[PDB]
Design an enzyme around this catalytic site. Structure first.
Site, PDB file in Angstrom:
ATOM      1  N   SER A 279       0.788  -1.240   0.000  1.00  0.00           N
ATOM      2  CA  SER A 279       0.000   0.000   0.000  1.00  0.00           C
ATOM      3  C   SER A 279       0.825   1.299   0.000  1.00  0.00           C
ATOM      4  O   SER A 279       0.258   2.391   0.029  1.00  0.00           O
ATOM      5  CB  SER A 279      -0.959   0.017   1.181  1.00  0.00           C
ATOM      6  OG  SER A 279      -0.247   0.239   2.374  1.00  0.00           O
TER       7      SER A 279
ATOM      8  N   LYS B  30      -5.943   4.572   8.962  1.00  0.00           N
ATOM      9  CA  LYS B  30      -4.947   5.421   8.308  1.00  0.00           C
ATOM     10  C   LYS B  30      -5.392   6.891   8.291  1.00  0.00           C
ATOM     11  O   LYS B  30      -4.597   7.791   8.580  1.00  0.00           O
ATOM     12  CB  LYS B  30      -4.701   4.928   6.897  1.00  0.00           C
ATOM     13  CG  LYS B  30      -3.939   3.602   6.829  1.00  0.00           C
ATOM     14  CD  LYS B  30      -3.936   3.077   5.403  1.00  0.00           C
ATOM     15  CE  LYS B  30      -3.093   1.814   5.262  1.00  0.00           C
ATOM     16  NZ  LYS B  30      -3.196   1.206   3.908  1.00  0.00           N
TER      17      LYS B  30
HETATM   18  B1  LIG Z   1       0.028  -0.816   3.470  1.00  0.00           B
HETATM   19  O1  LIG Z   1      -1.375  -0.836   4.110  1.00  0.00           O
HETATM   20  O2  LIG Z   1       0.165  -2.099   2.655  1.00  0.00           O
HETATM   21  C1  LIG Z   1       1.266  -0.351   4.415  1.00  0.00           C
HETATM   22  C2  LIG Z   1       2.554  -0.053   3.630  1.00  0.00           C
HETATM   23  C3  LIG Z   1       3.643   0.747   4.352  1.00  0.00           C
HETATM   24  C4  LIG Z   1       3.182   2.177   4.673  1.00  0.00           C
HETATM   25  C5  LIG Z   1       4.277   0.052   5.562  1.00  0.00           C
HETATM   26  N1  LIG Z   1       1.589  -1.440   5.345  1.00  0.00           N
HETATM   27  C6  LIG Z   1       0.885  -1.667   6.466  1.00  0.00           C
HETATM   28  O3  LIG Z   1      -0.061  -0.968   6.815  1.00  0.00           O
HETATM   29  C7  LIG Z   1       1.323  -2.813   7.343  1.00  0.00           C
HETATM   30  C8  LIG Z   1       0.178  -3.822   7.550  1.00  0.00           C
HETATM   31  C9  LIG Z   1      -0.051  -4.580   6.253  1.00  0.00           C
HETATM   32  C10 LIG Z   1      -1.045  -4.184   5.349  1.00  0.00           C
HETATM   33  C11 LIG Z   1      -1.229  -4.867   4.143  1.00  0.00           C
HETATM   34  C12 LIG Z   1      -0.437  -5.982   3.850  1.00  0.00           C
HETATM   35  C13 LIG Z   1       0.547  -6.387   4.749  1.00  0.00           C
HETATM   36  C14 LIG Z   1       0.755  -5.684   5.941  1.00  0.00           C
HETATM   37  N2  LIG Z   1       1.750  -2.174   8.572  1.00  0.00           N
HETATM   38  C15 LIG Z   1       3.035  -2.096   8.905  1.00  0.00           C
HETATM   39  O4  LIG Z   1       3.927  -2.580   8.210  1.00  0.00           O
HETATM   40  C16 LIG Z   1       3.388  -1.307  10.118  1.00  0.00           C
HETATM   41  C17 LIG Z   1       4.717  -1.000  10.407  1.00  0.00           C
HETATM   42  N3  LIG Z   1       5.018  -0.216  11.461  1.00  0.00           N
HETATM   43  C18 LIG Z   1       4.031   0.308  12.203  1.00  0.00           C
HETATM   44  C19 LIG Z   1       2.700   0.051  11.883  1.00  0.00           C
HETATM   45  N4  LIG Z   1       2.393  -0.747  10.857  1.00  0.00           N
HETATM   46 MG   LIG Z   2      -0.051   2.811   2.856  1.00  0.00          MG
END
Ligand SMILES: *[B]([O])([O])[C]([C][C]([C])[C])[N]C(=O)[C]([C]C1=[C][C]=[C][C]=[C]1)[N]C(=O)C1=[C]N=[C][C]=N1
Ligand SMILES: [Mg+2]
Ligand SMILES: *[B]([O])([O])[C]([C][C]([C])[C])[N]C(=O)[C]([C]C1=[C][C]=[C][C]=[C]1)[N]C(=O)C1=[C]N=[C][C]=N1
Ligand SMILES: *[B]([O])([O])[C]([C][C]([C])[C])[N]C(=O)[C]([C]C1=[C][C]=[C][C]=[C]1)[N]C(=O)C1=[C]N=[C][C]=N1
Ligand SMILES: *[B]([O])([O])[C]([C][C]([C])[C])[N]C(=O)[C]([C]C1=[C][C]=[C][C]=[C]1)[N]C(=O)C1=[C]N=[C][C]=N1
Ligand SMILES: *[B]([O])([O])[C]([C][C]([C])[C])[N]C(=O)[C]([C]C1=[C][C]=[C][C]=[C]1)[N]C(=O)C1=[C]N=[C][C]=N1
Ligand SMILES: *[B]([O])([O])[C]([C][C]([C])[C])[N]C(=O)[C]([C]C1=[C][C]=[C][C]=[C]1)[N]C(=O)C1=[C]N=[C][C]=N1
Ligand SMILES: [Mg+2]
Ligand SMILES: [Mg+2]
Ligand SMILES: [Mg+2]
Ligand SMILES: [Mg+2]
Ligand SMILES: [Mg+2]
Lengths: 290, 290, 290, 290, 290, 290
Positions: free
Chosen positions: A188, A231
């Site tokens: 994302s 978010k």
């Molecule tokens: B996104 O929603 O894929 C986002 C990308 C980036 C900004 C880190 N990642 C996340 O929100 C993830 C959870 C996740 C969502 C979708 C697929 C796999 C994982 N969160 C985190 O990596 C994270 C890291 N540090 C603090 C909070 N959240």
């Molecule tokens: Mg994101």
């Protein structure tokens, strides 16, 4: 060494502005207020001298001449501080609020967990090199592939965004997502990485008063993501009021408290080009990488 | 082969100093005491001959001429041993206490465990090469990424710190953290590695009477760390009284015993540039790597 | 094909020595005994002919002229076999005891286990190449990092030890520790690998009548090790009476039986330069690698 | 197309031999029998024509002239089939027993298991390349390191064995130990791999009527191995009667049945040079790799 | 800036068409209706100006001259909108239905699971490079090998499909299959990847109104796959009515509901050349990669 | 565009054959029947025109002249369809049975499992490149090493098989064994891979009416395999009647049903050269890779 703000204001009034006005052909048709001049200094320049200041004043005058071409007017059109963005675009510097000012090679992303959302900054450096890519900040494989897809999209669109044609074999890129110890993953931040990488390569600063989320396809399609409520709350709580979200997530906006949705400006996107046009200021603020 | 200290003191008084004074235009306006001359020899030179000595005396005289420009004076301004750092900067050598003297490619870091803190030295070599990086001393992945972020920051700021413009493809770097067998990890030596790497590349020695801790972002932001109490106690116990700490850890200082806080000078930092300005002596003490 | 030892002794007496003496300006002031000449042949040459012999005799004569410069003397100074090392340095060859004679690219190390100590030879080859490094003999990661630290130290000190300036991209190195099947690990062969690598690169043979142990830092500091008692007993049992040990292990010497300590000569070191000065004969005995 | 054996015998008697004899200065002093000529054809040539035959006859005549130099004789020295190896060395070809004839890039090794010994052939190809090394036949890590040590030894001794000086960057090597599926490991084929690699590089064929076992050090020391009884029995059972064994395994020979030891010729070795001198025929039989 | 659709229609009628007709030698023999002209604009051009429009009109006229060569006719042959594909081929653009219009570097694939079928788009970028290949979208090893087989087939057939002869060392390829997080595997997208890769390399757009499934052999044989019912239902449900399927899966078509089979056009294939001929429009729509 | 078969038959009779006959010096001595001419067209040419046809007719005539040299004859020697392979070799094309016709870069292998045997085709592409090797079709490590051994054998024998001398650094090879998903392993396709690789490199097509099995050593020895009964039954069941098998497996043939053995022609081999001579047609049918 340099001019004081008082000296900059005065030299602008007495020399720089009248010179730029007359060279643009607009003498007697446009003026700037003292407050407008000070805003140009504070929000559009960052320098010891006044070369940048003079350039910005020239931009104002030439934009005036553009308005004149659209239609003449009688008398003096006076440009006040509130008018400056109409002439110079989005403020380049925010000395009172530096953390949300535009920056080269950064972009504001949004993550989530089972307990809520988190703002995360994506950092990218473009340095002299040979086409190497480093991806750090304990990034998972899906997130690393997302960075690769963003980079490939940019390699295929160098003309569109004013990227160097040879960056693929003369520049090394490093994408880092602090903090260093915390694992991160997911697709994302595709648009977020595309923004930060494009900024680093083009030397055009990315706005940091906008937070974003969206998966990117190789051809630049913006794809839906999860955790919209968490978010957007996290953004709101951190005082970010401008959001970029995939068009396919429009239905999830209904889940926000009306009061939160009220204070958010949300731009729905289908293509990464829409993101880059919104995020990247048009003019580079640093010399090219090589 | 070389001059004795007695010979160096005498040749300085009789030939080197009066020559440098008159060439600087300061004859009759400045003088140095015998103790000042001996301090220059002992703490600012390391050589068989007196070329270095003569250079340092020239620096004193030219700094005198700078003070003269700020304002003239009547009579003789006499420079004693206690005044020497005002003219020559931080002592380059400490023959009585060699372990805390400035050194090229080292920096004093601080680690912790569930039972207390530990001083650790970061060592960096810059050698002729091709842009390779070795990271040894049983470093974990987070700590290795921290080194990479520090190096990228430096690659993006070669002008700022007087680094070679082509080090990225003509130099190999090796970061080593003794002792060899003990596993080490974490992001909190980011500023420490930035210091040691910048020192090795620039050939400017890093002070070793300062201990530091801080995570670095790719763009050089200094980020908060853990174990503040344990790390600062460990520094104090080892006789280090000057500390560099992230600004965001200021609140943790309250936890130290007042007596310990009393004997510590703490510099709070937000940007790695502040660290490098404090740690690196301005003039290189070794020839360039290539 | 070549001269017999009898022929070498005679041609030295009749032609080579008097020629070298008169060319050095020392005719009538110095002489060598028959036993001295035979020792030069046996312990300082290894050849079919007498070119090497003549060179060694020239060294003796020129060293004589050096003593003359320190102070003249009346009559003949006669050099006997027991005097030869004063003139030619440490014996280069030991035909009666070949296994402890100096060798290019080897060094005598010491290991331990829960049941006692073991002598281990470190072997290094330097061959035409491109900067590759092979590390074999079932070496663990810590021991491999130790080899890397030693090599980097040498890359940073090519002038000091007479190493080729371009070995980093024209030579491949291979460090091997027999026997092939036995796993080995730890940081305590840092000085041992530095010795063997420096020997291989410089073509200066390393003494094999000295056993050593010590961890090396990147900047060449010699750091304390474990198993002092076991390692020194193992050396003693194998008939090695000269030891190199870190200065920081001096306290552990108390643990040896007085009788063992009695028959050991121990050199305490703080810097790897002290090791290399003691171990490496000054003159190369093989042509350069490239 | 080519000559029949009858034609080769006749053309040798009538033209090739008398020509080579007179050109060597030995007319009237040496002769060869019909059986000697046929042995030269069968065991020292492999060709359609007689160029090789003529070369071998020239070798015989020149070796005759060497014997003449050692001491003249009256009358005709007649060379019969049993004398041919005195003049031409070890037979190059064995048409009646091809599997044990010398071959370029092979060597006969010996392995063991808890139930007995096994002959294994080491195969090596040297082909145009860039310094790559392939190691196949399901070889374990210790055995692979053994191959690397053997190769490095050869890289350091190119002059000694007539290897190309630039093979390290113009040749690729491939070491293969059939059969393909069976795992193999251990250090005891070090001398066997050194033999096969040296043969492949030099194009000098290695004898296959000799079986060998021994670990090699980097500097070429031959080190003791295990399974002496099992390996030597396996050799004996396969009809190999010539063995190469480390000197340090001499004590293990006592364990063989007297009858087996009776029919074995064992060469004890301390250095790999002794192995290569025994195994490799002096003259190359194929053109250089590049 | 550009022409309105009304202006494009008029300039085509008044200038572009009559020019192209007379230059083709067909004046008085062929005509186009207003609806035909608008279809050319809408479905065969994408531009601000009318260069593309004029080129397409020239294609129509020259195709007319081809029909004339096959056989003359009396009077005017009038080309209406329904006739345009006879002259210009498959529509290049579908402004009313953009998602199924032909695109450079994409192809519509079909996947299945235990609960049903899924459409998946294969995306490929071809960018300036050096012969690197990236494969992303969490692809399993079998699917990655399938991409490699497809690419090798294309490397062996550059002439056949109008691919650059030097793409293997001047272009980097990136194959991505969204969505980013979902694991994907299997060999049945071999023809789909061959289509997308060939499109990206040739700059000939691939039709997206056709869905496909089939394993590819290295020599281009199309091999049978699984999940025929699920995949074809998924296509039908998504409004894709044209399918490419391996000839060896013909027997599986019996399993579809007659109503579904009724609304599907299925092309059975044995060779990937048949796929590429059906999928790729003949003329490139973007400039070459390098 | 091209000639019909009727036109090809007629132009051969009237122009191509009489021209080739008279140019070979054989006018009046040899003739071809109509059926012979049609067989040349169908089984030895694949083209729109008749250049290939004319070349094949020239081959027939020159082979006739060879027979004439062996011995003259009176009257006309008439070549009928059944005679054509005597003149032109093994049929190059089999339009009625395309799957078993010779092909560039393929070979028919045989595998087994606990429940029976399976035919498997080995596919190899040789494309412009830099010496890279890809091995796909879920091949195990032993099978991959087998491919490497086959390739090395060919690199060492480029002259023998008419391979390009520089293929090792100008060609990339890709070995693929469909189907994509099924794991495969073992050493018994060594000769099969040698055949397919040699075919791809030489552009000489490999017969596909022969199935084979055999392990290859690095020097080209063919070594025994398992599953002889299962593999040969599988061949027989698939209508392959010509088999290549290792000589060391001759004893296993007794296990086949007499009826199966009756309809199989088995070639026992000891060396891979025997395989390549049997499998590869002598003349290339495609242009060189580079
Ligand atoms: B996104 O929603 O894929 C986002 C990308 C980036 C900004 C880190 N990642 C996340 O929100 C993830 C959870 C996740 C969502 C979708 C697929 C796999 C994982 N969160 C985190 O990596 C994270 C890291 N540090 C603090 C909070 N959240
Ligand atoms: Mg994101
Ligand atoms: B820092 O606090 O991240 C520091 C970095 C460097 C000086 C080793 N590391 C540590 O303090 C770690 C603990 C840790 C802190 C934060 C994240 C992960 C780990 N300590 C050690 O690595 C260590 C090593 N040897 C002795 C003592 N402590
Ligand atoms: B040293 O004390 O670190 C030494 C280095 C080299 C000579 C092998 N290693 C050892 O003594 C090790 C034990 C060890 C000590 C410290 C850290 C880790 C391991 N011993 C062996 O490796 C060994 C190998 N073969 C025989 C005996 N001992
Ligand atoms: B040697 O004794 O190290 C030898 C080397 C080579 C000829 C394979 N290896 C073996 O004898 C091994 C046993 C072994 C000995 C020592 C250390 C480790 C292993 N035997 C085999 O590998 C083997 C393979 N196939 C058949 C029989 N034995
Ligand atoms: B194909 O049938 O091999 C296809 C290839 C590509 C379009 C992903 N794969 C699949 O259908 C697989 C199942 C499978 C079939 C055959 C072998 C191994 C696996 N399905 C998926 O990978 C998948 C992924 N996302 C959604 C649905 N299905
Ligand atoms: B061969 O007998 O080694 C052969 C090689 C190649 C044609 C795949 N392999 C096999 O027959 C293997 C079994 C095996 C034999 C010997 C060693 C290890 C394994 N069979 C298969 O790999 C297989 C694959 N698909 C279908 C059937 N069998
Ligand atoms: Mg720290
Ligand atoms: Mg040790
Ligand atoms: Mg062995
Ligand atoms: Mg599919
Ligand atoms: Mg097989």
């Amino acid at each position: 060494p340099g001019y004081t703000n008082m000296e900059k204001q005065a030299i602008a009034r007495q020399y720089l502005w009248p010179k730029q006005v007359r060279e643009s052909g607009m003498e007697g048709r446009i003026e700037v207020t003292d407050a407008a001049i000070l805003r140009v200094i504070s929000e559009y320049t960052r320098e010891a001298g006044v070369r940048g200041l003079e350039r910005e004043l020239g931009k104002i005058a030439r934009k005036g001449a553009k308005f004149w071409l659209e239609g003449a007017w009688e008398g003096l059109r006076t440009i006040d501080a509130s008018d400056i963005p109409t002439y110079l675009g989005i403020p380049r510097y925010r000395p009172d609020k530096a953390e949300t000012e535009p920056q080269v090679g950064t972009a504001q992303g949004l993550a989530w967990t089972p307990v809520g959302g988190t703002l995360l900054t994506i950092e990218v450096a473009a340095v002299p090199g040979s086409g190497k890519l480093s991806l750090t900040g304990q990034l998972g494989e899906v997130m690393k592939e997302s960075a690769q897809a963003a980079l490939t999209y940019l390699r295929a669109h160098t003309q569109d965004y004013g990227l160097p044609e040879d960056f693929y074999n003369k520049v090394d890129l490093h994408v880092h997502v602090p903090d260093g110890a915390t694992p991160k993953d997911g697709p994302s931040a595709g648009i977020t990485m595309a923004t930060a990488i494009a900024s680093a390569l083009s030397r055009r600063p990315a706005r940091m008063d906008i937070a974003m989320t969206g998966e990117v396809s190789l051809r630049g399609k913006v794809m839906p993501i999860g955790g919209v409520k968490e978010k957007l709350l996290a953004a709101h709580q951190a005082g970010i009021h401008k959001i970029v979200l995939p068009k396919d997530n429009e239905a999830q906006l209904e889940e926000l408290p009306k009061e939160v949705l009220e204070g958010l400006e949300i731009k729905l996107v289908e293509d990464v080009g829409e993101v880059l046009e919104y995020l990247l200021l048009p003019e580079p603020t640093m010399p090219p990488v090589v």
